[PDB]
Amino acid sequence: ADTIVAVELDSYPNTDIGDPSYPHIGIDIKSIRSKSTARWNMQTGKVGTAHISYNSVAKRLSAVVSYTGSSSTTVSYDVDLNNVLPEWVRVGLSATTGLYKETNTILSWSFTSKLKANSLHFSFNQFSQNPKDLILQGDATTDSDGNLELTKVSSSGDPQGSSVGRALFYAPVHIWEKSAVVASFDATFTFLIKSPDRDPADGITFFIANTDTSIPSGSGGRLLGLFPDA
Amino acid sequence: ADTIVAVELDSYPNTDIGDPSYPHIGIDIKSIRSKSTARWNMQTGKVGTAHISYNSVAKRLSAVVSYTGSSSTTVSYDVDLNNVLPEWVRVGLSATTGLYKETNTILSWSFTSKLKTANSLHFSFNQFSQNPKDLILQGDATTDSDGNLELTKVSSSGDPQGSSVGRALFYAPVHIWEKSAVVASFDATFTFLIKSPDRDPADGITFFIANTDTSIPSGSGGRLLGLFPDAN
Ligand SMILES: [Ca+2]
Ligand SMILES: [Ca+2]
Ligand SMILES: [Ca+2]
Ligand SMILES: [Mn+2]
Ligand SMILES: [Mn+2]
Ligand SMILES: [Mn+2]
Ligand SMILES: [Mn+2]
Ligand SMILES: [Mn+2]
Ligand SMILES: [Mn+2]
Numbered sequence: 001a002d003t004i005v006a007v008e009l010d011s012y013p014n015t016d017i018g019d020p021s022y023p024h025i026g027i028d029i030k031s032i033r034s035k036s037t038a039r040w041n042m043q044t045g046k047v048g049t050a051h052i053s054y055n056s057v058a059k060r061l062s063a064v065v066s067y068t069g070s071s072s073t074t075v076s077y078d079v080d081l082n083n084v085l086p087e088w089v090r091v092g093l094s095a096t097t098g099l100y101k102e103t104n105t106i107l108s109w110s111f112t113s114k115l116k117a118n119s120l121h122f123s124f125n126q127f128s129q130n131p132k133d134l135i136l137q138g139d140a141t142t143d144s145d146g147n148l149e150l151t152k153v154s155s156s157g158d159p160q161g162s163s164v165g166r167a168l169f170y171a172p173v174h175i176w177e178k179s180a181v182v183a184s185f186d187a188t189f190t191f192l193i194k195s196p197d198r199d200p201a202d203g204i205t206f207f208i209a210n211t212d213t214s215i216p217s218g219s220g221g222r223l224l225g226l227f228p229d230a
Numbered sequence: 231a232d233t234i235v236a237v238e239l240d241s242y243p244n245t246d247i248g249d250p251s252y253p254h255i256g257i258d259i260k261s262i263r264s265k266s267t268a269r270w271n272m273q274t275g276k277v278g279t280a281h282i283s284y285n286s287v288a289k290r291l292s293a294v295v296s297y298t299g300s301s302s303t304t305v306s307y308d309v310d311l312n313n314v315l316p317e318w319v320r321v322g323l324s325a326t327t328g329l330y331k332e333t334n335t336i337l338s339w340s341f342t343s344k345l346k347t348a349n350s351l352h353f354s355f356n357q358f359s360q361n362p363k364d365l366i367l368q369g370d371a372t373t374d375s376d377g378n379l380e381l382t383k384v385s386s387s388g389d390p391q392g393s394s395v396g397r398a399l400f401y402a403p404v405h406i407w408e409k410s411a412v413v414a415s416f417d418a419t420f421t422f423l424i425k426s427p428d429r430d431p432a433d434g435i436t437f438f439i440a441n442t443d444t445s446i447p448s449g450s451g452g453r454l455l456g457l458f459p460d461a462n
């Protein structure tokens with residue numbers, strides 16, 4: 001079973017598995033049952049931005065999601081990630097649609113990791129047709145507009161249900177080493193969630209996992225393509 | 231047949247294949263016979279620093295090698311790398327030894343690529359782990375307990391060995407160009423320590439850019455720096 005650390009943008013309330021009764025963003029530490037969550041005032045059809053950051057001294061994983069012209073949503077959790085994650089990891093984005101759907105379009109994504117100092121940084125303001133520097137899993141694809149469509153969309157751009165997909169950066173990341181003075185990382189991605197459904201689903205996540213991580217079987221829908229069970 | 235673009239720190243003069251008659255640094259475009267070279271006043275036993283840069287507007291690949299408290303060595307060559315390299319590549323470092331030898335120790339390596347279609351990739355190693363999962367080690371290349379990358383074999387006692395070849399490629403491919411892109415550039419730097427028991431150290435170290443699936447060619451040892459199958 002993979003080891004997962006993620007920040008979820010949960011658009012669909014799955015109260016039968018721990019979610020609060022409303023769209024929310026949360027911090028998941030080895031389980032879909034977020035250790036911390038904050039109400040997320042979604043704005044489908046509007047481009048949002050998510051920023052995630054962490055450093056080994058403060059030991060506080062934080063995330064902020066926002067849209068232009070509106071107050072943001074933030075969430076944090078005190079945790080020693082070096083204790084949870086292996087020294088080497090791959091970082092990525094995931095998304096899923098189930099009975100209900102939504103577009104899980106990524107317009108841009110950047111990540112920076114520093115180990116005190118060695119470093120890894122990448123930035124995509126648009127994605128290439130054949131992103132050789134990305135590992136596409138499931139239905140994840142990049143469209144003609146240079147955007148990353150984590151889940152299946154029609155020619156018109158209309159979302160489809162029962163879809164799952166993720167994109168991991170090709171190169172493993174060394175997030176920690178013995179005696180390391182300080183290790184830190186931060187990620188940012190812009191997204192566009194659209195949907196005809198009264199209640200869109202299921203969400204998008206930025207996650208960090210073991211380097212050989214793959215879509216767990218039965219991880220569709222509410223499990224955001226990250227966990228095998230609830 | 232890989233496509234190679236490299237900046238060579240040629241410590242051994244092989245005049246039989248076009249090398250000038252003195253240690254030198256050079257810019258190689260699909261051939262070991264440098265398109266441009268400059269005399270390299272080596273400081274064996276001293277830590278050196280090499281800097282390589284290029285951008286699609288200026289179209290001038292330049293490299294500078296220096297040591298603390300000494301005059302630097304520079305070499306340049308005008309060339310549109312878009313007419314040579316494929317759109318996706320892997321970057322790396324190579325080194326070899328032949329009858330004569332030398333340590334080809336890399337103490338640090340950084341690289342930055344920018345593509346304004348601006349997308350970018352950047353990595354830096356101030357030390358290397360024993361199990362560098364973000365590096366593709368080829369040939370004899372290995373990282374040591376000191377955290378340094380030994381491109382070519384060195385005895386457990388630190389003494390270099392001849393007839394060795396090794397390379398280290400960064401794991402993720404690099405997108406250096408795309409049609410209609412506005413501008414693209416890359417920057418690379420690495421520090422190295424070349425030590426030798428031989429009056430004439432050989433054969434050299436290089437920073438190269440090649441097709442993503444690049445591998446050490448057969449017969450690329452010694453004077454071929456682990457980059458080419460022949461000296462054509
Ligand atoms: Ca949910
Ligand atoms: Ca030579
Ligand atoms: Ca192209
Ligand atoms: Mn949730
Ligand atoms: Mn930040
Ligand atoms: Mn850096
Ligand atoms: Mn690209
Ligand atoms: Mn030469
Ligand atoms: Mn950048």
Ligand SMILES: [Mn+2]
Pocket residue numbers: 118174357358359
């Ligand atoms: Mn490392």
